């Protein structure tokens, strides 16, 4: 039939477009590991020339980075409900991940 | 007909495409596993951190908020509706407490 041809050509491209994206995240995952390995190796070398204190000057993985304007007021609320955190901003913000900051710093 | 073996050809290619995805699904699932094994060595966890200087170099200006939470922590951000508009972040952590560093 005919629409059995239109159905597989749309499904083809789909498969193709998905298999492609999968091969992209697959190398990204590889890049994530080498970046993590080098980051560890980098911190071990720095410790041999110096140990940094825990709550200060250090951020452990995983983490996120929230970026907003200097004029933006940030509020942190904890309620009666458990395992809940609520941050409020009076203006727009951006969220960045551990993976992206590792890429921005090289590895 | 031009269409009936446009079919047989297309229906001959998707299985190569099918198996390629099966392969790519197995490669991804034990690449992820190998990533999980590395980040929970106790020696590796000891040095899995970043400093202020690193954050500052990748984020020019402004106010920076660093939030650290255990794995599996869920982050929910609602739509900027109006009630003034609301920009918020809902954090749910079941495995522990969260640590927030104000970067300068």
């Amino acid at each position: 039939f005919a629409q059995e041809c239109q159905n597989l050509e749309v499904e083809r491209q789909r498969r193709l477009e998905r298999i492609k994206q999968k091969q992209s995240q697959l190398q990204e995952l590889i890049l994530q590991q080498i970046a993590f390995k080098n980051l560890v190796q980098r911190n071990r070398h720095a410790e041999q020339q110096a140990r940094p204190p825990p709550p200060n000057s250090v951020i452990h993985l995983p983490f996120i980075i929230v970026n907003t304007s200097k004029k933006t007021v940030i509020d942190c609320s904890i309620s009666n409900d458990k395992f809940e955190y609520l941050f409020n901003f009076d203006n727009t913000f951006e969220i960045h991940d551990d993976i992206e900051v590792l890429k921005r710093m090289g590895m | 007909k031009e269409v009936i073996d446009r079919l047989r050809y297309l229906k001959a290619e998707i299985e190569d495409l099918e198996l390629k995805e099966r392969e790519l699904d197995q490669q991804k699932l034990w690449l992820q596993q190998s990533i999980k094994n590395v980040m929970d060595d106790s020696i590796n966890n000891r040095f899995s951190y970043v400093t202020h200087e690193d954050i500052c170099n990748c984020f020019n200006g402004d106010t920076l908020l660093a939030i650290q939470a255990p794995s599996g922590t869920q982050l929910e951000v609602p739509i900027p509706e109006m009630g003034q508009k609301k920009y918020q972040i809902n954090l749910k952590s079941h495995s522990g407490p969260i640590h927030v560093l104000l970067i300068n």
Binding site: F93, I95, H96 | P70, T73, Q74, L75, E76, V77
Partner: peptide
Amino acid sequence: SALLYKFNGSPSKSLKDINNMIRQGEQRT
């Protein structure tokens, strides 16, 4: 009615969609 992100278990594509949503806000249809 909201976008979700998971610490050490969610693609960075998730945060990109979150950042775009916040920057754009409510859109005309």
